[PDB]
Amino acid sequence: EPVFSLEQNRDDAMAALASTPTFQQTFINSISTQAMDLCKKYNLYPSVMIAQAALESNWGRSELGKAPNYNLFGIKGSYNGKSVTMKTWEYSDSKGWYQINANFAKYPSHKESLEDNAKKLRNGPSWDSSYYKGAWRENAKTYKDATAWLQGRYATDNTYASKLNTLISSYNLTQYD
Known part of the structure; x- marks a missing residue:
């Protein structure tokens, strides 16, 4: 038969806690x-x-x-004038998959x-x-x-x-x- 206890609940809760x-x-x-x-x-x-x-x-x-x-x-x-350039993939029936530089916010x-x-x-x-x-x-x-x-x-x-x-x-x- 189960016996209720707040103290035990808290102890179990903490025992089960994961830190991250x-x-x-x-x-x-x-x-x-x-x-x-x-x-x-x-x-x-x-x-x-x-x-x-x-x-x-x-x-x-x-x-x-x-x-x-x-x-x-x-x-x-x-975004408010700020950006970063990097290569990205583009596709066209004409050229296929190709890389290109683009500006990103x-x-x-x-x-x-x-x-x-x-x-x-x-x-x-x-x-x-x-x-x-x-x-x-x-x-x-x-x-x-x-x-x-x-x-x-x-x-x-x-x-x-x-x-x-x-x-x-x-x-x-x-x-x-």
């Missing part, structure tokens, strides 16, 4: 606060933003994603990179401000509607939504929504 999360979990932990704030300001799903950031940056390990560039989404151009931190993603979704590309409307929280009943909307639009990749959904459930990213 996986690099994957640590990456999520490092951007979740800013994602919640920005996604509230732009009315988007934080779970979808965090999943996108992990996917597009390889858990923050790509050369663009880590310091001192902080460019999680591999956005081309500059350079941010002060991950925060401004996340904000660019939020602006992109909410404000849209210049030719259609409502392009990502299906990922707006006021139009998407669940995050699955949002990810389904990004597929074919944000990236050409017919399993894009499925990848985002897998990240979201595997790390319970809806806790942030």
Whole structure:
């Protein structure tokens, strides 16, 4: 017959404690606060933003994603005049796969990179401000509607939504929504 004890509970809890999360979990932990704030300001799903950031940056390990560039989404151009040049792959039916130098935005931190993603979704590309409307929280009943909307639009990749959904459930990213 079980006997309840707070002292024992605390001792068990501490005995089970792990000192360090996986690099994957640590990456999520490092951007979740800013994602919640920005996604509230732009009315988007934080779970979808965090999943996108992990996917597009390889858990923050790509050369663009880590310091001192902080460019999680591999956005081309500059940010307030700042940029970094590096080789990137391009494809054309004409030449095939080939490398080329491009300029990528350079941010002060991950925060401004996340904000660019939020602006992109909410404000849209210049030719259609409502392009990502299906990922707006006021139009998407669940995050699955949002990810389904990004597929074919944000990236050409017919399993894009499925990848985002897998990240979201595997790390319970809806806790942030």
